[PDB]
Amino acid sequence: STAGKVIKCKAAVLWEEKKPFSIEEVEVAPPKAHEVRIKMVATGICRSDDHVVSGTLVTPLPVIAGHEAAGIVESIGEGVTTVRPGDKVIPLFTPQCGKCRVCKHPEGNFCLKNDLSMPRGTMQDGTSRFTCRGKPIHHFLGTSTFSQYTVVDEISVAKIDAASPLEKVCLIGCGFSTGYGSAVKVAKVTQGSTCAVFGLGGVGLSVIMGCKAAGAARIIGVDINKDKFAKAKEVGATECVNPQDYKKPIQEVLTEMSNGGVDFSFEVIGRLDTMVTALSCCQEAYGVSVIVGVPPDSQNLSMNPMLLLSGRTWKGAIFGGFKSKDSVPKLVADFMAKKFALDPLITHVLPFEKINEGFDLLRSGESIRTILTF
Amino acid sequence: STAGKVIKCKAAVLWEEKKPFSIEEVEVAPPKAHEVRIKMVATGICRSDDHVVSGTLVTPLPVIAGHEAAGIVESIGEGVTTVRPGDKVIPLFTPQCGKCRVCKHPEGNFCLKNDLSMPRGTMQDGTSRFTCRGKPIHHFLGTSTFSQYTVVDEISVAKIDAASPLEKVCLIGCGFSTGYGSAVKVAKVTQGSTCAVFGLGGVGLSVIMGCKAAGAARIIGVDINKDKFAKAKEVGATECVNPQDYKKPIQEVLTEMSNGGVDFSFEVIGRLDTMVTALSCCQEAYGVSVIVGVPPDSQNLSMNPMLLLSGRTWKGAIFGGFKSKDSVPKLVADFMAKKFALDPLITHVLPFEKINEGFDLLRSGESIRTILTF
Ligand SMILES: NC(=O)c1ccc[n+]([C@@H]2O[C@H](COP(=O)([O-])OP(=O)([O-])OC[C@H]3O[C@@H](n4cnc5c(N)[nH+]cnc54)[C@H](O)[C@@H]3O)[C@@H](O)[C@H]2O)c1
Ligand SMILES: NC(=O)c1ccc[n+]([C@@H]2O[C@H](COP(=O)([O-])OP(=O)([O-])OC[C@H]3O[C@@H](n4cnc5c(N)[nH+]cnc54)[C@H](O)[C@@H]3O)[C@@H](O)[C@H]2O)c1
Ligand SMILES: [Zn+2]
Ligand SMILES: [Zn+2]
Ligand SMILES: [Zn+2]
Ligand SMILES: [Zn+2]
């Protein structure tokens, strides 16, 4: 009943940095060629969405944020072949165009069509599908999931199992896949190894899940909020340390605890200092450190390259290294077969209209993931 | 006969930084338990030896430098099982104790018994075998090859083929193995890939040799000294670029030349700026950059961690990642079997007494490797 028509619906519009979202009516244009309009069902609150608010992650404003979500296709534009109306879908904040040199590379996943490296806040065609108060509103990472309806490019959506529980599998759209893949795919954690995970939010807990799935013998969680430790141990941490408890820098503490450095470390916070600490704490000759946290816009870290010359490997990744469109449906299928759990990440459920309370819960340190229901 | 006796011989002593080597008589003590005294036959001039002179690489002075060499065992201390008097040997500036967690790790080679991290300038037992004018003289990297005789710990020497030409295979003691391994073992260059090699000295040429051996389709040499380009092309570079010739930064040039970034880059100079440029020029999603150049003492680089978050891998290595004592004899056997060439690295052959002339050739940009012959 809405195909080819503008939809008026509620969205969470961010007009200004460091302000609450405004829940108000927007106009969502119908999909153009190779575009898909989605009725959203559930969306998670990822710290990266908060980074938009705080100006940590710069993207044009005003904007409809949200990138961790699931919904049901309302309509498809001309030439769409990979989804149909009524399909369950997860928007892909990292696209998979299938054509660029990264998509063709066996390891690569950061498709050249992404809107993360130099955000423009548009559809692929450089325009917006959103109007609010007669004003155009930017997209975010091609997804804009904080809206009852969004429009995405076909390369930014994956069809998932029709029997999927959308209020759970929305986490496959960012935090779970990112953390789990950072361990299993990017780091390639080995059986019997020692891991250190800096930051025990939804993404860091997913890193722990992946380290445990990979057979790590020791998984040391690191957080300045000791309230995070109990859940980290539930999902596989063997021990947790709070840097604030120690006189010495935590890289020295972790090096001593691991009898000369860890096999794999993960920065899952977004601070320059913890990126360098996490590198330093991995064993100097054969250690691997993976950056997962989003750094503050345009800021450089300082480090001694002798940390690398001795043999360390330093890498980072978006979305756990997963080729998004190939991987998301498989991750959903694995979830349905109980190959991993998502409930440990979900601490709070709210209606979409309580989005600002959901961000309050994240900022206070209380929540891991709040799932918003439309 | 010399066994069990002090040897008086000629060595090149560096009494203080930024001075010529002093060629004079030293006393070399006999080897203690698990030590080996070696009559030197040939030693190369590596830029790392010059770093000791320039204060780029800090190690205790006064010192007998030299780490790239080959010679013949004169005598063995009690308990030595791996070499005998008369054997051809290469000193190992990276030891292989076989017992530490690094030596037992499949991918580690920076043995914890090394004297590079935190240089003491002694034997393993914390003492020196060298005196000169009644003063103790430090060792360098457990090797000290700028001497007619040296004493090394057993874990710092490898036996090699008795028919080895020592005036060539001394390069397996540092520059060839470092560069070649950095390509084939550390980076794991792939067939059909595009490589960029920053610095076309003896080590960078050995990186090119490894990239060509691994089947790279394109190998871009980068040097500010265009006199280095002809030999780079002879050993496999498909093209060479001088950053001084361009208005743009060379990372932008190399990204354009490679249609979006190279597969593998190598820093083979020792400058913070070229370490960051080399990382930046590899493809942002799947590129790999290897640091080979020794950085200036205690200086930190500045970089944006978004370079890693998109998917790049950044690593470094000592001695090409080779486990030294296992690898050196095999590299010499491979050379004897014509699997690689060393003559392209050798531009000058001088008597040992002309060490300062050999360093002046390196500093002027006029040599690759000078081999000093005893
Ligand atoms: N690379 C990707 O594709 C990707 C995906 C998803 C999230 N992210 C980023 O990953 C980071 C974590 O996201 P999240 O799990 O949703 O966030 P979160 O829930 O805010 O978790 C971060 C955790 O870090 C802890 N912390 C803060 N400061 C320190 C410190 N100094 N030392 C140790 N712990 C500290 C903090 O207490 C919290 O539990 C954020 O920067 C996100 O933007 C990146
Ligand atoms: N990691 C290891 O185990 C290891 C082993 C051997 C050597 N090294 C280091 O590797 C580096 C190279 O050694 P080498 O080949 O003997 O030295 P080298 O022969 O002096 O070669 C260095 C090359 O870099 C070139 N160069 C200088 N500045 C620039 C610049 N700004 N941009 C481009 N090219 C430039 C220079 O012209 C020369 O051809 C040195 O820092 C050594 O200390 C490290
Ligand atoms: Zn693509
Ligand atoms: Zn996210
Ligand atoms: Zn060892
Ligand atoms: Zn060297």
CATH of the domain at A250: 3.40.50.720
Which residues pair with residue B314 across a beta bridge?
Answer: A314, B289
Name residue B77's beta-bridge partners: none
Q: What angle do CA A81, A87, A91 make, to 5 degrees?
A: 80
What is the rounded CA–CA span in Å between residue A277 and residue A251? 5
With contact defined as beta carbons under 8 Å apart, do A281 and A196 qualify?
yes
Cα–Cα distance measured from residue B318 to residue B181, given in angstroms and rounded to the nearest whole number: 9
Pair of tokens at residue B146: 């700028």
Nearest CA to ligand 2 atom 27: B269
Cis peptide before B62 (omega within 30 of 0): yes
How many CB atoms are located within 10 Å of the residue B297 CB? 13
In the reported structure, the alpha carbon of residue A327 is separated from the centroid of ligand 3 by a whole-number distance in angstroms of 14
Backbone angles phi, psi at B53, to 5 degrees: -60, -45
Cα–ligand 2 centroid distance for B54 (angstroms): 14
Q: What is the resolution of this structure in A?
A: 1.1
Is A241 among the annotated ligand-binding positions?
Answer: no
Exposure string (b/e) for B14-31, b if CB count within 10 Å is 16 or more?
beeeeeebeeeebbbbbb
Q: Which ranges constitute the DSSP H helices of A227-340? A: 229-234, 250-257, 272-281, 306-309, 324-336
Place of tokens 């940095």: A17
Interface of A with B (CB under 8 A): 101-102, 105, 107-110, 112, 117, 259-260, 272, 275, 283-286, 291-292, 294-295, 298-306, 308-318, 321
Instruction: Look at residues B88, B92, B86 and name the one whose alpha carbon lies nearest to residue B68.
Output: B92
B128, B138, B156, B174: which one is catalytic? B174
Strand order in the sheet with B264-267: A239-241, A218-222, A194-198, A264-267, A288-291, A313-316, B313-316, B288-291, B264-267, B194-198, B218-222, B239-241
Distance of CA B129 to the CA centre of its chain: 23
Experiment type: X-ray
Residue with tokens 């005893």: B374
Q: Does residue A71 sit in helix, strand or coil?
A: strand
Contact partners, residue B187, CB within 8 Å, separation at least 6: B264, B266, B288, B290
CA B317 to ligand 2: nearest atom? 1
Pocket flag, ligand 1, residue A47 (CB < 6 Å): yes
Q: What's the CA gap between A128 and A135, in Å, rounded?
A: 10
Torsion region of A236: left, alpha or beta (phi above 0 gives left; psi -120 to 50 gives alpha) = left
CA distance B223 to B240: 8
Distance CA A175, CA A368 (A): 10
DSSP H helical segments within chain B, as ranges? 47-54, 101-104, 166-169, 175-181, 202-213, 229-234, 250-257, 272-281, 306-309, 324-336, 355-363
Q: Would you call A13 exposed, middle or buried from its count of C-beta atoms within 10 A (0-12, 13-18, 19+)?
A: buried
Catalytic site residue A46? yes
CB contact under 8 A, A300 and B302: yes
Residue pair A147/A27 in contact (Cβ under 8 Å)? The answer is no
Q: Enumerate the H helices of A134-259 as residue ranges.
A: 166-169, 175-181, 202-213, 229-234, 250-257
Q: Indicate the residue type of A53.
A: V
Residue A139 to residues A5, A40, A93, B123, B250, Cα–Cα distance (Å): 19, 15, 11, 64, 34
Handedness of CA A104, A105, A106, A108 (dihedral sign): negative
Q: Do B110 and A275 touch (CB under 8 A)?
A: no
Q: Is A347 buried (19+), middle (13-18) or exposed (0-12) by CB count in 10 A? A: middle
Of A23, A22, A326, A347, the closest CA to residue A175 belongs to A347
Identity at B303, one-letter amino acid code? M
Residue A339 makes CB contacts below 8 A (sequence gap 6+) with none
How close is the nearest chain B Cα to the Cα of A329, in Å?
Answer: 22
Taking the C-alpha atoms of residue A80 and residue A156, their distance in angstroms, rounded to an integer, is 12
Question: Tokens 């205790």 belong to which residue?
Answer: B60
Backbone angles phi, psi at B202, to 5 degrees: -55, -40
Query: For strand A264-267 and strand B135-137, is the pairing parallel, antiparallel, or unpaired?
Result: unpaired
Structure tokens at B63: 């010192």
Neighbour-count burial of A343, counting CB atoms closer than 10 A to its CB (0-12 exposed, 13-18 middle, 19+ buried): exposed
Residue A193, both tokens: 């190894």
Q: Which residues contact A181 (CB under 8 A, 6 or more apart)?
A: A210, A317, A319, A320, A321, A322, A327
B237 near B197, Cβ under 8 Å?
Answer: yes
Residues in chain A: 374
Chain B residues with CB within 8 Å of chain A CB = 101-102, 105, 107-110, 112, 117, 259-260, 272, 275, 283-286, 291, 294-295, 298-306, 308-318, 321
CA distance to A244, A251, B296, B370, per residue, from A257 (Å): 16, 10, 31, 46
Q: Phi/psi at B298 (nearest 5 deg)?
A: 70, 10
Any idea what DSSP says for residue A188? Answer: -
Element (H, E) at A54: helix A47-54
Q: Which of B222, B212, B220 is nearest to B189 (CA)?
A: B212
Residue for token pair 């155009």:
A136
What is the distance between the alpha carbons of residues B165 and B196, in angstroms, rounded to a whole number? Answer: 32
Largest CA distance in chain A: 65
Pairing, β B149-153 against β A135-137: unpaired
CB contact under 8 A, B303 and A300: yes
Which residue, B150, B6, B128, B149, is CA-closest to B62?
Answer: B128
Distance between CA B46 and CA B236 in Å, rounded? 22
* C-alpha to C-alpha distance for B17 and B23, rounded to whole angstroms: 16
Please say whether the beta carbons of A146 and A11 come within 8 A.
Answer: yes
Question: Has A170 been labeled as part of a binding site?
Answer: no
Does the C-beta of A321 come closer than 6 Å to ligand 1? Answer: no
As a whole number of angstroms, the distance between CA A338 and CA A352 comes to 27
User: Do B231 and B299 meet the contact criterion of CB atoms below 8 Å apart?
Assistant: no
Distance CA B312, CA B304 (A): 12
User: What are the Cα distances from residue B177, in Å, to B51, B267, B369?
Assistant: 19, 16, 14
Contact B90, B72 (CB under 8 A): no
DSSP 3-state percent helix, strand, coil across chain A (nearest 5): 30, 25, 45
* Cβ atoms A99, A180 nearer than 8 A: no
Helix axes B47-54, B355-363, angle to 10 degrees: 90
- Domain span holding position B232: 176-320
Residue with tokens 């700028």: B146
CA terminus-to-terminus distance, chain A: 19
Residue A312: list chain B partners with CB under 8 A. 315-316
Q: Which segments of chain B are extended strands (E)?
A: 7-13, 22-28, 35-44, 69-76, 88-91, 130-132, 135-137, 149-153, 157-159, 194-198, 218-222, 239-241, 264-267, 288-291, 301-303, 313-316, 346-351, 369-373
Query: How far is it, in rounded angstroms, from Cα B241 to Cα A75?
Result: 52
| Ligand-binding site membership of B202 (annotated) | yes
Q: Which two tokens stand for residue A44?
A: 């998670």
Q: What six digits make up the tokens of A327?
A: 């991987």
d(CA A296, CA A48): 11
* Cβ pair A163, A336 in contact under 8 A: yes
Sole residue written with tokens 């020794």: B294
